[PDB]
């Protein structure tokens, strides 16, 4: 029932030349930009990724961005968002992408990465977020993928770590933060990206979950993150990155959430909001640009539904998990 | 517009002198109440800055070591103060929610009854605010707070009014806890039956009821060895969402749980009916389809192996 209902004059066509243009031009100079700079390593990642889907991550500045990154990583070993922030699990994450992207990771120092990644598991297998302790099946996920990229998964205990994101599995087929906590696309994202990246899909109830997921989709042909709720552009890379994860993608009406991912296109500055006629934000461009492709856009570099980066850069680091048939 | 314009630009301004005094201060060893009063100003607005969550943390160690116990305990009440004002104007802020509960894990006796006053609160404002339900069972777990309790809770929510997963979501996980074992009792599973079946013909349109049922369908040890009173209630149920296809002709929940409940009972007697309830559905639910016809397909190919298995 609750739903966004497209405009008859919504963009129905890709506009890769605007989006290029507004992510290109982002950050130049700004209030929310200013105040999101907690996050900017992450931000960072969104831009050269979907720039790099485009073919264009070329007029990004590679060498800034390397001076930022080595700028960010902490005497622990764990990068920051930004000079001066505090160095946590998700942007050690991020850094590392955009270093795989770059091919430039020995940029940081690679095994205190891994001894802050390490030093971050519970008794439990479970992942804090940073030496402040918050648990969330995100930081489960962090930590595989950044191991990953880096070839060090066995740094970890994985046994352990796999027990707990199995006790994150719900009622319905899905996942969420912690023991207990309800099913949310964000952390079905996380967790089944955990298990392709750990080996063990087979625990995943593929046909229960993949319900659940593709009844995400809403009458307007958007995907919401959890029953009941309104739909968002970036769920097209949470609720569809996990359904390929587990071999159901065909379980989504493709032409209809199309044509929902081109209507959050803003026709004039470019770049995709959560929804049609909302303020676009790099976040959203990733994820709509990143859910285009994984429906199949001519366009689009194809991506890797456990990454989040274009399939081409995993090929050659040799990290390509198997997913369910 | 200019006026609009020109007040978060003053308003950035501020923030970033703030933001600079805050870093200076730490790079300088200065953990201090001033640091708490420039971080509650940037907090305010921008409670995702978790990095002066951390700058807070800091300082209220720092402070305890140095200031009486009176003097902390001061301080404590403060911050629980400034906490809640935190979430009033951003209630999903993960660091907001954190540093609470940072807060009172530090605590030698909390008050935790009042936490779960807070949790009540806050859901009945929102009652879909996974943050709020994760400090609940935090809270709960802490204060040991027995399953049979919480799941009081979840009744009267449910009843209340719809909206409504993270309520069925939450009976999900500790219904089983009433009910442990290395699967739920019958006499556990056909009074659930009842609770959502009430709630779906009261509501047919609530989706939740429709998820947490069709678990409860699959939840039974271990049939068809149906007794005589789960195969009168399960054909019962079918029969009413058959009435309920009549009243509501659109709605795909009700046709679906047919098809569940013919399976139920048995998929090879209903063979011919589950076959006509997928063209249905399919036309119903076009969005579906394909998750339809693969489901299908497994119903057939059970069908198979339950023929083959004559004898
Ligand atoms: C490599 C990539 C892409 C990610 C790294 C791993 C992380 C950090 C994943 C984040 C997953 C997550 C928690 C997504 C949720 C984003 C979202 C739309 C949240 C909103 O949730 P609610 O609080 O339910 O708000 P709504 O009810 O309004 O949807
Ligand atoms: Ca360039
Ligand atoms: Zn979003």
């Given at each position: 029932?609750?739903?966004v209902?497209?405009k008859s004059?919504?963009?129905?066509?890709?506009?890769?030349?605007?989006?290029?243009?507004?992510?290109?031009?982002?950050?130049?100079?700004?209030?929310?930009?200013?105040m999101?700079?907690?996050?900017?390593?992450?931000?960072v990642?969104?831009?050269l990724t979907?720039?790099?889907?485009?073919?264009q991550?070329?007029?990004?500045?590679?060498?800034?961005?390397?001076?930022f990154?080595?700028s960010?990583?902490?005497?622990?070993?764990?990068?920051?968002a930004?000079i001066?922030?505090?160095p946590?699990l998700?942007?050690?994450?991020?850094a590392?992408?955009?270093?795989?992207?770059?091919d430039?990771?020995?940029?940081?120092?690679?095994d205190?990465?891994?001894?802050?990644?390490?030093?971050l598991?519970?008794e439990?297998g479970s992942?804090?977020?940073?030496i402040w302790?918050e648990?969330?099946t995100?930081?489960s996920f962090c930590?595989?993928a950044?191991?990953?990229?880096?070839?060090?998964?066995?740094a970890?205990n994985?046994?352990?770590?796999i027990?707990?994101?199995?006790?994150?599995?719900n009622?319905?087929?899905?996942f969420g933060?912690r023991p207990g906590?309800?099913?949310?696309?964000?952390?079905?994202?996380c967790?089944?990206?955990?298990?392709?990246?750990?080996?063990?899909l087979?625990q995943?109830?593929?046909?229960?979950?993949?319900?659940?997921?593709?009844?995400?989709q809403?009458?307007?042909?958007g995907?919401?993150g959890?029953?009941?709720?309104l739909?968002?552009?970036?769920?097209?890379?949470?609720?569809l990155?996990?359904?390929?994860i587990?071999?159901?993608?065909?379980?989504i009406?493709?032409?209809?959430l199309?044509?929902?991912?081109?209507?959050?296109?803003?026709?004039?500055?470019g770049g995709?909001?959560?929804?049609?006629?909302?303020?676009?934000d790099?976040?959203?461009?990733?994820?709509?640009?990143?859910?285009?492709?994984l429906?199949?856009?001519?366009?689009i570099?194809?991506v890797?539904?456990?990454?989040?980066?274009?399939?081409e850069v995993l090929?050659?680091?040799?990290?390509?998990?198997?997913?369910?048939? | 517009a200019?006026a609009?314009?020109?007040?978060?630009?003053?308003?950035l301004?501020?923030?970033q002198?703030?933001?600079?005094?805050?870093?200076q201060?730490?790079?300088?060893?200065?953990?201090?109440?001033?640091?708490?009063?420039?971080?509650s100003?940037i907090?305010?607005?921008?409670?995702?800055?978790?990095?002066?969550?951390?700058?807070?943390?800091?300082?209220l160690?720092?402070?305890?070591?140095?200031?009486?116990?009176?003097?902390?305990?001061?301080?404590?009440?403060?911050?629980?103060?400034?906490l809640?004002?935190?979430l009033?104007?951003?209630?999903?802020?993960?660091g907001?929610?954190?540093?609470?509960?940072?807060?009172?894990?530090?605590?030698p006796?909390?008050?935790?009854?009042?936490?779960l006053?807070?949790?009540?609160?806050?859901?009945?404002?929102?009652?879909?605010?996974?943050?709020?339900?994760?400090?609940?069972?935090?809270?709960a777990?802490?204060?040991?707070?027995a399953p049979?309790?919480?799941?009081a809770?979840?009744?009267?929510?449910?009843?209340?009014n719809?909206?409504?997963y993270?309520s069925?979501?939450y009976?999900?996980?500790?219904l089983?806890?009433?009910?442990?074992?290395?699967?739920?009792?019958?006499?556990?599973?056909?009074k659930?039956?009842?609770?959502?079946?009430?709630?779906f013909?009261?509501?047919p349109?609530?989706q939740?009821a429709?998820?947490?049922?069709?678990?409860?369908?699959?939840?039974?040890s271990?049939?068809?060895?149906?007794?005589?009173?789960?195969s009168?209630?399960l054909?019962?149920?079918?029969?009413?969402?058959?009435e309920?296809?009549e009243?509501?002709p659109?709605?795909k929940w009700?046709?679906?749980?047919?098809?569940?409940?013919?399976?139920?009972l048995?998929?090879?007697?209903?063979?011919?009916?589950?076959?006509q309830?997928?063209?249905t559905?399919k036309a119903?639910?076009?969005?579906?389809?394909?998750?339809?016809?693969?489901?299908?397909s497994?119903?057939?190919?059970?069908?198979?192996?339950?023929?083959?298995?004559?004898?």
């Open positions: 029932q609750k739903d209902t497209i004059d919504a963009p129905d066509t890709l506009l890769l030349e605007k989006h290029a243009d507004y992510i290109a031009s982002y950050g130049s100079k700004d209030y929310e930009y200013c999101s700079e907690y996050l900017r390593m992450s931000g990642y969104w831009g979907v720039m790099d889907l485009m073919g991550l070329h007029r990004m500045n590679k060498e800034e961005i390397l001076v990154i080595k960010c990583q902490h005497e622990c070993g764990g990068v920051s930004s001066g922030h505090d946590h998700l942007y050690t994450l991020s590392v992408q955009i270093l795989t992207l770059y430039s990771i020995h940029v940081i120092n690679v205190k990465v891994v001894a802050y990644v390490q030093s598991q519970k439990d992942f804090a977020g940073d302790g648990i969330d995100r930081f930590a595989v950044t191991l990953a990229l880096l070839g060090k998964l066995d970890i994985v046994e352990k770590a027990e707990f994101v199995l006790s994150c599995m009622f319905d087929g899905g933060c906590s309800e099913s949310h696309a964000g952390q079905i994202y967790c089944t990206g955990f298990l392709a990246i750990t080996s063990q087979h995943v109830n593929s046909d229960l979950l993949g319900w659940w997921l593709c009844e995400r809403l009458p307007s042909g995907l919401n959890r029953p009941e709720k739909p968002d552009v970036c769920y097209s890379w949470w609720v990155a996990s359904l390929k587990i071999g159901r993608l065909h379980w009406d493709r032409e209809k199309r044509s929902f991912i081109l209507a959050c296109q803003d026709e004039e500055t995709f909001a959560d929804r049609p006629g909302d303020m676009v790099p976040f959203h461009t990733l994820f709509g640009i990143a859910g285009l492709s429906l199949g856009e001519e366009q570099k194809p890797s539904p456990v990454f989040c980066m274009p399939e090929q050659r680091v040799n990290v390509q998990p198997e997913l369910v048939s | 200019e609009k314009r020109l007040e978060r630009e003053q308003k301004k501020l923030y002198s703030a933001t600079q005094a805050v870093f201060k730490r790079q300088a060893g200065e953990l201090d109440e001033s640091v708490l009063e420039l971080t100003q907090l305010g607005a921008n409670p995702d800055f978790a990095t002066l969550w951390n700058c807070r943390r800091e300082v160690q720092h402070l305890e070591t140095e200031k009486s116990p009176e003097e902390s305990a001061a301080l404590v009440k403060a911050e629980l103060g400034f809640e004002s935190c009033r104007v951003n209630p999903k802020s993960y907001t929610w954190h540093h609470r509960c940072w807060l009172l894990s530090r605590l006796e909390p008050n935790w009854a009042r936490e006053e807070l949790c009540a609160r806050f859901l009945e404002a929102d009652e879909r605010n996974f943050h709020c339900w994760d400090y609940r069972r935090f809270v777990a802490q204060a040991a707070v049979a309790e919480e799941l809770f979840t009744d009267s929510l449910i009843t209340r719809f909206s409504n993270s069925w979501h009976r999900s996980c500790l089983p806890q009433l009910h442990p074992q290395p699967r739920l009792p019958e006499n556990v599973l056909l659930e039956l009842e609770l959502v079946q009430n709630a013909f009261t509501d349109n609530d939740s429709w998820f947490y049922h069709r678990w409860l369908l699959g939840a039974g271990g049939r068809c060895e149906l007794s005589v009173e789960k009168t209630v054909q019962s149920e079918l029969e009413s969402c058959k309920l296809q009243l509501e659109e709605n009700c046709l679906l749980t047919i098809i569940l409940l013919m399976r139920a048995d998929p090879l007697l209903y063979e011919k009916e589950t076959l309830y997928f063209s559905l119903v639910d076009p969005m579906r389809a394909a998750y339809l016809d693969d489901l299908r497994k119903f057939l190919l059970e069908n198979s192996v339950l023929k083959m298995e004559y004898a």
